[PDB]
Structures are given as C-alpha cells and as structure tokens.
Amino acid sequence: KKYFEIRWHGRAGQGAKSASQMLAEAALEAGKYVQAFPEYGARTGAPMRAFNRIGDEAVENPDVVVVIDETLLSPAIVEGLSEDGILLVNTVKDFEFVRKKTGFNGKICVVDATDIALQEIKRGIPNTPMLGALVRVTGIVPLEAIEKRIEKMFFPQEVIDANKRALRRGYEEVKCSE
Numbered sequence: 261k262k263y264f265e266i267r268w269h270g271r272a273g274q275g276a277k278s279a280s281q282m283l284a285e286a287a288l289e290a291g292k293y294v295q296a297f298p299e300y301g302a303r304t305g306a307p308m309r310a311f312n313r314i315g316d317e318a319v320e321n322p323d324v325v326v327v328i329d330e331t332l333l334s335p336a337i338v339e340g341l342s343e344d345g346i347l348l349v350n351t352v353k354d355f356e357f358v359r360k361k362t363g364f365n366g367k368i369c370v371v372d373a374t375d376i377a378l379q380e381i382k383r384g385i386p387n388t389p390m391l392g393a394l395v396r397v398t399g400i401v402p403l404e405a406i407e408k409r410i411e412k413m414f415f416p417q418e419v420i421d422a423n424k425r426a427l428r429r430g431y432e433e434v435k436c437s438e
Contacts, residue, residue: 263293263313264400267322267340269332272306275387276328280310282413283391286405287314307332314400324348324398328373328386333361341366346397348434350374350386355437369397371434380426381419388423389430396431403431 266283270276277298284296293315300308311319321340327333330351338347343366349358350373358368371393373386381388388410395403407424414420 262315263295264316264398265319265322266312266314266324266326266394266398266400267319268310268312268326268328269337270308270310270328270387271332272300272302272304272308274328275385276308276310276326279328279387279391280312282406282409283312283394283401284314286401286409287312289408290401290405292316292401324394326390326394328390333358335361335363338362338364348390348393348397350390366437367397368437369393369434371430373430376429376433377426380429381422388426389433392427392430392432393434395427396434397436403427 268276268280280296284294287294295313296311298308298310324346325338325341326348327337328350330349346367346369347364348369351370352372355368371389373389374384376389377386378384391406395401395406406427410423411420
C-alpha cells in the first residue's frame with residue numbers, strides 16, 4: 261500500500277534495467293522514496309526482470325507489469341498482477357492476442373515502442389518509449405521528470421532531443437483496453 265510497484269520483463273540488452281533506473285532516478289529528484297534493481301540468471305538475450313518501488317505517501321505483487329519483448333508473454337509473466345492493475349506491452353499486436361498469451365483480464369496497454377525508437381533514435385531498443393507509455397498509463401511521475409533525466413544522462417542536443425521525442429511518442433501513442 262505504501263509503495264507503487266512495477267515489474268519489468270525483457271531480455272538482456274533491451275534496456276529494462278536502465279529504464280527501471282531512470283524511472284527511479286526521476287522519482288528520486290521529485291523527493292519520492294524509491295527502490296530499483298534487476299534480477300538476472302544469464303547469455304546476452306537471456307530473459308530477465310527489473311523492479312521499481314516508488315513510495316506514494318523481489319516484486320511478487322506488482323501494480324503494473326511491463327513486457328518490452330512480446331516474445332516473453334506467458335501466464336507466468338502475469339503472476340501477482342491484480343485485476344485493477346496494468347499489463348503494458350511493446351507489441352504491434354492487439355489486446356486479444358495479449359489476453360490469449362497471458363490470460364490477463366484487466367487493463368492491457370500496447371504500443372509499438374521498437375518502431376518509435378527506430379524512427380526517433382535510429383535503434384530498435386524499446387525502453388524509452390516504454391517509459392513514456394508507462395508514465396502515460398500510470399501517471400507515476402510527470403513526463404518532464406524523465407525528460408530532465410534524459411538531459412542529464414547525455415552528447416549533442418540532437419541526440420538528446422531524439423531521445424525525448426522517443427519518450428513523448430510512447431507517451432502519446434500507447435493504446436488501452438479500458
């Protein structure tokens with residue numbers, strides 16, 4: 261109840277750990293209590309998890325599950341996710357497909373983060389648009405806080421702006437089940 265919780269699923273290389281860090285770093289600058297760490301068992305491309313706990317005045321019961329590689333979708337990936345919780349996915353497919361793969365009745369949000377990134381940052385790493393999508397569907401922090409963080413992690417402004425556009429476009433384009 262004291263912490264809002266998010267559990268990420270991606271494969272080594274897709275940036276779940278960095279995205280997780282960045283979100284945490286954003287909430288930290290806002291004066292929030294935060295925790296964030298990864299959990300591996302790895303090759304490069306090995307499935308992994310990252311976690312965030314962000315105070316709101318091993319994550320077995322997350323408020324949101326974020327799957328940045330559709331390939332990892334399975335009913336195990338949705339363990340502990342309440343019905344009033346969110347399943348957020350990087351996918352070009354639809355809610356029905358995601359529902360079939362997981363068995364999650366509950367809000368399912370999807371966005372083609374890979375393609376947003378190929379367009380904006382010229383890389384198929386989906387983590388920044390997934391962050392923007394996350395901020396959009398949960399409101400867990402303001403988008404400006406992540407942008408401020410994008411500013412601090414970088415480099416010429418061009419590359420900074422491209423990354424901020426990638427965040428904004430995931431924020432704008434995510435679509436929801438309910």
